[PDB]
Design a protein around this nucleic acid. Sequence first.
RNA 1: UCGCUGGCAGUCGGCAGAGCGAGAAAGAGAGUGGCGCGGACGCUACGCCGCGACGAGUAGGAGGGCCGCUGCGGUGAGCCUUGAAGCCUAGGGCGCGGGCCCGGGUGGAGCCGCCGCAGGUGCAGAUCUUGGUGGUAGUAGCAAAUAUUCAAACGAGAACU
RNA 2: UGCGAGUGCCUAGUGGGCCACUUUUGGUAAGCAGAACUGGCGCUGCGGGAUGAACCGAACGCCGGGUUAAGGCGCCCGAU
RNA 3: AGGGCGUGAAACCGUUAAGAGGUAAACGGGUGGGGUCCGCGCAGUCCGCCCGGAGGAUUCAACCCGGCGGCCGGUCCGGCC
Lengths: 53, 128, 187, 147
Amino acid sequence: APSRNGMILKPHFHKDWQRRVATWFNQPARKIRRRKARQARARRIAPRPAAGP
Amino acid sequence: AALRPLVKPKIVKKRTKKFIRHQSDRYVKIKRNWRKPRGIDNRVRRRFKGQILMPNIGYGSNKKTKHMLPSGFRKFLVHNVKELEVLLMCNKSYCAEIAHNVSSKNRKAIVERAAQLAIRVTNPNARL
Amino acid sequence: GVDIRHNKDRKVRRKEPKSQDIYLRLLVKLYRFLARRTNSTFNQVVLKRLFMSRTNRPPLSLSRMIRKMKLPGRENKTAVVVGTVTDDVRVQEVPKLKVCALRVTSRARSRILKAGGKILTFDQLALDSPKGRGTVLLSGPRKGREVYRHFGKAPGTPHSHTKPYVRSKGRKFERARGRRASRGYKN
Amino acid sequence: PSRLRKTRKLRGHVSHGHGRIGKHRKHPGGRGNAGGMHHHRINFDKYHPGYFGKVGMRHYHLKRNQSFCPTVNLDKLWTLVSEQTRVNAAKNKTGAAPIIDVVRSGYYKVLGKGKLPKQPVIVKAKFFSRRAEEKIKGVGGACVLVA
RNA sequence: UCGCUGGCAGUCGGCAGAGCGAGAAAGAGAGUGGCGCGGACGCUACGCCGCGACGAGUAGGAGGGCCGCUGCGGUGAGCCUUGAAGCCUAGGGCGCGGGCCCGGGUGGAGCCGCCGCAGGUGCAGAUCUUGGUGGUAGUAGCAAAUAUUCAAACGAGAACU
RNA sequence: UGCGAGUGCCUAGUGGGCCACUUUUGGUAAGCAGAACUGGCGCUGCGGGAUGAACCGAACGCCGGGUUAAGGCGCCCGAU
RNA sequence: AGGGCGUGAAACCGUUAAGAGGUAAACGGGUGGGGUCCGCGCAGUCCGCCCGGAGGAUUCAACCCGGCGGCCGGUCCGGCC
Ligand SMILES: [Mg+2]
Ligand SMILES: [Mg+2]
Ligand SMILES: [Mg+2]
Ligand SMILES: [Mg+2]
Ligand SMILES: [Mg+2]
Ligand SMILES: [Mg+2]
Ligand SMILES: [Mg+2]
Ligand SMILES: [Mg+2]
Ligand SMILES: [Mg+2]
Ligand SMILES: [Mg+2]
Ligand SMILES: [Mg+2]
Ligand SMILES: [Mg+2]
Ligand SMILES: [Mg+2]
Ligand SMILES: [Mg+2]
Ligand SMILES: [Mg+2]
Ligand SMILES: [Mg+2]
Ligand SMILES: [Mg+2]
Ligand SMILES: [Mg+2]
Ligand SMILES: [Mg+2]
Ligand SMILES: [Mg+2]
Ligand SMILES: [Mg+2]
Ligand SMILES: [Mg+2]
Ligand SMILES: [Mg+2]
Ligand SMILES: [Mg+2]
Ligand SMILES: [Mg+2]
Ligand SMILES: [Mg+2]
Ligand SMILES: [Mg+2]
Ligand SMILES: [Mg+2]
Ligand SMILES: [Mg+2]
Ligand SMILES: [Mg+2]
């Protein structure tokens, strides 16, 4: 129920948002994995530029 | 002769009995620790004549003689001999206590050091 | 019994700064001593403002300070701000200034010093003039915050230019029925 | 921190600060912002005029990149270049005028709000306003349009 | 508790000179001529001190908790098999109170204070959940379908084998 | 005559009431139903009305001394 | 710690001891009596200065030698910021 002066809001929380919540607890692990793969590629192409063409 | 304090004023206490919780006599599930009654129809809360009293702020003790043991000293808890040099200069006003956890062999040394420093101990012959 | 009311017995003003800044509390100790042991109301005002919150000591601008210091009569006096002196980029020429302030932004400091002014902390101000004589006490606009355009007579009430709380400004947001005259009525 | 909040002080008080006559029920007025037309009518009228109804045209595929045009003011005009430029231009007696290209700074339209220091300039923008152009003329200078 | 948004940095000491309460603004003002080596306490200023008035309270609001429970970072050259936690106590006390500290006993391996941080953090009730125990009470009851007695044997023991 | 005032935010609970002197509508009347003004009870203990939500007195921190209010002073039961 | 055996609480029960008992019991305020323990109670405080009397020391003030420290040089010299 509305109260004294305030903003009228529209939260999109009427579906079942809790059965699909994407947390980011593996963000550091993903960064480490990406940079390890990057280094592996950089040293598998020995003299070529790391960033590609 | 024990160690007398600096001054021994007449200690006046506004009440000696404790404040027991309402209906703590009737039940065992209700302990005597005070809880403020909050019932709508409760005669102790509404302070009817002849009921249990309540802990007002008016029962507070005189600030000059507050926290004062019957001997005229204020308690202090000691766990080892290094914290009697603290009371070395609070000599005539504060006494010492050996914590219940301290073993007998350290309780001894605490007792003789306190005797040397003229600090009064209220439990000097506790365990032996 | 006595026939009185106890609603307004307790005053609400601050007695100490709400903050825990140790430098601020040293300043407060100093100015408590000065206000108690002198007869100048300048020190009383200064510590009263030291007690205040940030919204009650808004930033002051070089433009306001320069204008108020070039007002006639108050030549080469010390401007005093119990807030923050911020830089104002839409001002070209900076005169010589003698400012005392709690904190000054880096570009404001650079401008003032390059123009040849002098910036003081409140301990130096106390050393220089214990009674705060020769000083012009200023403050920032206290109702400049955006929050204040939402206050007062409620929007949607005749003759009330109050800003409403809208999630977003646009064509479809709170513009039809209490706003037009075609769509029903106009407030 | 739960130590500092209000639930810790309400232990021992029966109703938890919600009264005893009117209890804390579940939704005593409807979910969300229902009843805007019916039983919250005067709240909606008293704080949200214009909330109900339609007005204006529709635009089916609107593109903010098309509608993008930031603005700058004659107060901030001289900020877009180094003060070395201004000092050297004022010092120089040849009469050369510095070029102020606002598209490089990221502005498209020049609006003239405040004073402009007495110094010639060549302002190189995409759009201009009439008052901004007259102020630049009055200080003595050119407004060159770019695409 | 509130108000006075009162007072106190002046502990200005032999490099000394003890003051700031008293009806009626403002200088214990500066200058120019006419022996014996001495003097309590205090002020964690988030402290201490001094005057006045005031003190009912459900719904509700706010503040303070050196009230209490569990865990983390610091810290106590902390405590403990010469006895920790827990539990019991006609023992001694403190606090207005939440609570807490000692003594005795039982117990046998861990625990606590202070500065911050975090919360699945305090029960008398909900025909609350689970487990346990009373009065009722040695009470109700051991009454559908006719029926048992004698002797012996075994057996520690027989109305019932 | 008395008194320090002005002003801004955020805000919970409430939105079943009841009683009494005087005014008063319906009703035979009601411990009935409905209004006006003020004060109470709800939210409030205390002395008296033996007993009692609203009656009379008087409103409350913990205490010592003194004196009163309303009501009382054969005995219960303090006081002729 | 005696094979469902670490610690072993409360409700409930047995026994021992103490007390009491015709207005169910329990409760608040005020005393009184009796118990259990404590005070380690049972001839009751010390602390400064001075006077007097018996004592006992390597012993005071002053002076000299060495070391350390605190404050200055109206403007000593030298550094550092
Ligand atoms: Mg609400
Ligand atoms: Mg009631
Ligand atoms: Mg009063
Ligand atoms: Mg009140
Ligand atoms: Mg108030
Ligand atoms: Mg309450
Ligand atoms: Mg609430
Ligand atoms: Mg309820
Ligand atoms: Mg409600
Ligand atoms: Mg209701
Ligand atoms: Mg809700
Ligand atoms: Mg109160
Ligand atoms: Mg073991
Ligand atoms: Mg947890
Ligand atoms: Mg529990
Ligand atoms: Mg329970
Ligand atoms: Mg039987
Ligand atoms: Mg039977
Ligand atoms: Mg049968
Ligand atoms: Mg009626
Ligand atoms: Mg009610
Ligand atoms: Mg009221
Ligand atoms: Mg009343
Ligand atoms: Mg009667
Ligand atoms: Mg009296
Ligand atoms: Mg009578
Ligand atoms: Mg065992
Ligand atoms: Mg066992
Ligand atoms: Mg027993
Ligand atoms: Mg017996």
